[PDB]
């Protein structure tokens, strides 16, 4: 096959993407070993769905797992009556998701299970895939002529040819695996044919963070989770928390091999130690550095000029309310709270009004990083930890280090009941989720 593995793409046809996926245990070859994973479409990752604004999506999910499941269309601003976090598809049953892609939308999104209490093992076992919304901006020459690749970053651990089970410490920290894969492959080689690469990046891991850096090169950020920036932003490294997406341009500077690495990063994961009295909790400290892939630059590379503008960010109405959400932890219980409460699917936590703008102040009073996600309503990050954000773009996940406050601008779009939660999905399963009702 091609030196660089990427998931199969399914494209809409005549404005319609109509597909039947099955969620099923699947024998496959992965990282040089035979394993049984849970997959959509028979592959890991699942197929990449590629659509345009205003296309109709008709996706019938058949559940061939021994447990109930459902789909979350992560990042898409569609109705919570379609992207329904309370829906359960029993084993052997099917459900069809049908929606129109919003007109003012572009970027990389993804789909994965969202059935409260079962997300972490189902996501860890391989149930995820990407969705790309192609834009008219892809036709400007500085992007059209770049070589485009999707990179799904997902780690895994195998025990007896199956995904390793969760331990108690996994429920507290979030499970990380020792196989750190790109598109399901272990350290693939990307042989570039053009000097400018456009890389869509997706962190589909349960809990692992990727502090991304390409040897000898900066990255040019052009899209965040849910849309383009206003103009490219040069960065020396890019931290991708669970659930986050980015699109970056790489401008290859000379011939050679360059490693794309996940540099050491300390997210506050905890271990246990016994030195006399105790046992007591002790920080795991920073992650070990990982090589994600090998990037081979072509001969005599002469990258294109960067685009000078991308997409103007909309002028939002003045906000009508300020909310304050506080995140806290009980690590030894592996219990996680928002404003002192655990999730309850019958309780509405916040009531807002559609087509108004709200300011959400989300405060991490724990010691771990927590990546906060809101369904249905993408947001603009104004500041995090008191530092103003360096760009304007739609996001739907924002990472908060211990102690930090993020200030968001949240336009409320579709009416209905939806959720917000930590995207360390073990923490959501263990209660760090609440209910927003928009009317
Ligand atoms: Cu998600
Ligand atoms: Cu969390
Ligand atoms: Cu969710
Ligand atoms: Na299948």
The DSSP code sequence of 188-245 is -EEE-SSSEEEEEEEE--SS--EEEEETTB-EEEEEETTEEEEEEEEES-EEE-TT-E
Residue 315, C-beta contacts closer than 8 angstroms, at least 6 positions apart: none
Compute, in angstroms, the gap from residue 299 CA to the centroid of ligand 3: 44
Q: How far from 352 is each of 72, 138, 263, 392, 411, CA to CA, in Å?
A: 22, 35, 40, 24, 10
- 375 annotated as ligand-binding: yes
Domain ranges of the chain: 1-134, 135-311, 312-439
Q: Is 3.40.50.720 the CATH number for 1-134?
A: no
Q: Whose atoms come closest to the Cα of 204: which ligand?
A: 1
Compute, in angstroms, the gap from residue 346 CA to the centroid of ligand 4: 34
Q: What is the resolution of this structure in A?
A: 1.9
Compute, in angstroms, the gap from residue 111 CA to the centroid of ligand 1: 7
Technique used to solve these coordinates: X-ray
Residue 36, C-beta contacts closer than 8 angstroms, at least 6 positions apart: 25, 26, 27, 28, 161, 162
Compute, in angstroms, the gap from residue 418 CA to the centroid of ligand 3: 9
Q: How far from 74 is each of 71, 80, 373, 397, 426, CA to CA, in Å?
A: 9, 11, 9, 10, 17
Superfamily of domain 312-439: Cupredoxins -  blue copper proteins (2.60.40.420)
Compute, in angstroms, the gap from residue 30 CA to the centroid of ligand 1: 23
- 112 annotated as ligand-binding: yes
Helix (H, G, I), strand (E, B) or coil at 425: helix
For residue 177 the two structure tokens come to 């695996």
Q: What backbone torsions phi and psi does residue 150 show, to the nearest 5 degrees?
A: -95, 135
- 280 annotated as ligand-binding: no
Q: Which helix (H) or strand (E) holds 63?
A: strand 56-63
- 427 annotated as ligand-binding: yes
CA dist., res. 343 & res. 333, Å (int): 15
- For 286-307, the DSSP string reads SPPPEEEEEEEE-SS--PPPPP
- 166 annotated as ligand-binding: no
Compute, in angstroms, the gap from residue 304 CA to the centroid of ligand 2: 40
Q: Are 108 and 131 within 8 A, CB to CB?
A: yes
Q: Give the angle 251-253-254 at the CA atoms, nearest 5°.
A: 140
Q: Whose atoms come closest to the Cα of 85: which ligand?
A: 3
Compute, in angstroms, the gap from residue 423 CA to the centroid of ligand 2: 6
Compute, in angstroms, the gap from residue 192 CA to the centroid of ligand 1: 30
Q: Residue 144: how many CB atoms within 10 A of its CB?
A: 12
Q: Is 3.20.20.70 the CATH number for 135-311?
A: no
Q: What backbone torsions phi and psi does residue 348 show, to the nearest 5 degrees?
A: -90, 125
Q: Bridge-partner residues for 395, per DSSP? A: 379
């Amino acid at each position: 096959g091609p030196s660089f593995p990427e998931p199969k793409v399914v494209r809409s046809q005549g404005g319609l993407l109509s597909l039947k996926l099955s969620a099923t245990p699947t024998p496959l070859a992965i990282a040089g070993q035979r394993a049984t994973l849970l997959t959509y479409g028979g592959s890991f990752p699942g197929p990449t769905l590629r659509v345009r604004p205003r296309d109709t999506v008709r996706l019938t999910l058949e559940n061939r797992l021994p447990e109930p499941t459902n789909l979350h269309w992560h990042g898409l601003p569609i109705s919570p009556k379609v992207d329904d976090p309370f829906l359960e598809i029993p084993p052997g049953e099917s459900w069809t998701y049908e929606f129109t892609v919003p007109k003012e939308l572009a970027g990389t999104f993804w789909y994965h299970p969202h059935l409260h209490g079962r997300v972490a093992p189902q996501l860890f076992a391989g149930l995820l895939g990407a969705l790309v919304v192609e834009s008219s901006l892809d036709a400007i020459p500085e992007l059209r002529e770049a070589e485009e690749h999707l990179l799904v970053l997902k780690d895994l651990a195998l025990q007896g040819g199956r995904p390793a089970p969760h331990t108690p410490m996994d429920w507290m920290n979030g499970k990380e695996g020792d196989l750190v894969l790109v598109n399901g492959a272990l350290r693939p080689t990307l042989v570039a044919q053009k000097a400018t690469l456009r890389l869509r990046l997706l962190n589909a891991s349960n809990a692992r963070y990727y502090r991304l850096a390409l040897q000898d090169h900066p990255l040019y950020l052009i899209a965040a989770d849910g849309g383009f920036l206003e103009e490219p932003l040069e960065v020396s490294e890019l931290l991708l928390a669970p659930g986050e997406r980015a699109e970056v341009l790489v401008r290859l500077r000379k011939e050679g091999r360059f490693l794309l690495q996940a540099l050491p990063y300390d997210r506050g994961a905890m271990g246990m130690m016994d030195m006399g009295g105790m046992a007591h909790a002790m920080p795991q400290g920073p992650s070990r550095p990982e090589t994600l892939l090998y990037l081979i630059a072509p001969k005599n590379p002469k990258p294109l000029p960067l685009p000078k503008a991308l997409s103007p960010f909309p002028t939002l109405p003045a906000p009508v309310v300020t909310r304050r959400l506080v995140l806290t932890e009980d690590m030894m219980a592996a219990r996680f709270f928002i404003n002192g409460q655990v999730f309850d699917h019958r309780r509405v936590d916040l009531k807002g009004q559609a087509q108004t703008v709200e300011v959400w102040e989300v405060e991490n009073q724990g010691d771990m990083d927590h990546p906060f996600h809101l369904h249905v309503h993408p947001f603009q990050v104004l500041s995090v930890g008191g530092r103003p954000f360096p760009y304007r773009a739609w996001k739907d996940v924002v990472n908060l280090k211990a102690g930090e406050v993020a200030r968001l601008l949240v336009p409320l779009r579709e009416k209905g009941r939806t959720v917000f939660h930590c995207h360390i999905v073990e923490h959501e399963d263990r209660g760090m989720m609440g209910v927003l009702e928009v009317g």
